[PDB]
Amino acid sequence: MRILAIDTATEACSVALWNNGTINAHFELCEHTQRILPMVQEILAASGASLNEIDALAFGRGPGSFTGVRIGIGIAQGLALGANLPMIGVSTLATMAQGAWRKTGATRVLAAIDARMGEVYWAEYQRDAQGVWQGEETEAVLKPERVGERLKQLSGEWATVGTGWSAWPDLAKECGLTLHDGEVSLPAAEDMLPIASQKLAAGETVAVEHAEPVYL
Template identity: 45%
Template sequence: MMTTLLALDTSTEACSVALLHKGEKIHLDEMAQRTHTKRILPMIDEILAQAGIGLAQTDALVFGRGPGSFTGVRVGAGIAQGLALGADLPVIPISNLTAMAQQGYETCGAERVLCAIDARMNEVYFSGLQAEKVRWENEEFIQWRAIIEEKVCRPQQAIELIDSLQGDFLRVGTGWNAYTEFTQRELDNRSAIELPSAQYMLSLALPLYRQKQWISAVEIEPVYLRNEVTWKKLPGRE
């Protein structure tokens, strides 16, 4: 039986929705500066209508759990929780940094990726990832191993970590053009991939769904990385 997954992401300036249905992917991507709350639900309705199904006919909900902007990550988590509770769906949270690495793999064939999203305040959300091929029920999937764990750090700290690595890496994300520490340094393999998209979260979520590695709606928790960020817990959490 084919799996149907609905993915959404509002963690950055981009707003995106994607659907895996009958083995095919469809997606909608928009730039939505400060309009995520107005656009995300109509985009979800549109993509479900394109496929001719309702939310209850999906098997699981996938969402970008961060890191990203405080408001954007919180909006995505809240929408995902509300939809999952209403339709009684399991949830699969996906790292936005890893989603960009997956895009680098699918579009550029990159198996080693450095991810940097501009976090403002002279910091970036940063990680280094290595692709590894795994098989599950006669299908091959890509999973990502962290060479540099997700963190929020200053550009100079990221450069010091990069200098400790060997080999070539594809660079993805808005962070690389945001700060002079990066632009003045001769770093190779800068890609055109700047922001995460929900369509690449589907590839990451499918093997997790097959292996029943999901959570319930009440377990949803945004990932901000900044310790000083405080937030009111989502409805349903103690």
């Protein structure tokens, strides 16, 4: 089964294709559109796959750039609609947590995105025994001050991901947790795949008209 993933939620622009484990992905910094179509077409030609054949299109539902996310979803809805494909919304936070697992093996992650105007998109994600990232209900838009306040309520060791940490260097400083560097600052489509894969298996897909950015 195949899954095409696209993301434009943050400063990064990426596309990836899942084909029974085998992955074809493209990543780069970005205009959040002029590069997507060529990437999509690049990946499809590379893997020698047709949009019509794919089983589902995974889209970056954010949170991230208010404009960035909406653009990626629009193109994703177009690609999926013209090919009668189910869509799967993947969290930008969870996506990065998957990235930390891949690069460091971290199973507990604190995701913090440096949102504009001194705001931070926050999430506490913990991978369970089935390999599923738990904690989606913890996603939120917070003030740096409120985050450091949260940290004091957590315990154990965690890996950190997101631009939020570099933006607010004292967060990891003043907390009594054991923090490890998740080595992931921005989301990658290749990381959305594993998560999309499991959601597809659980049948958590949405029709094109229901694909929307997450609201926090």
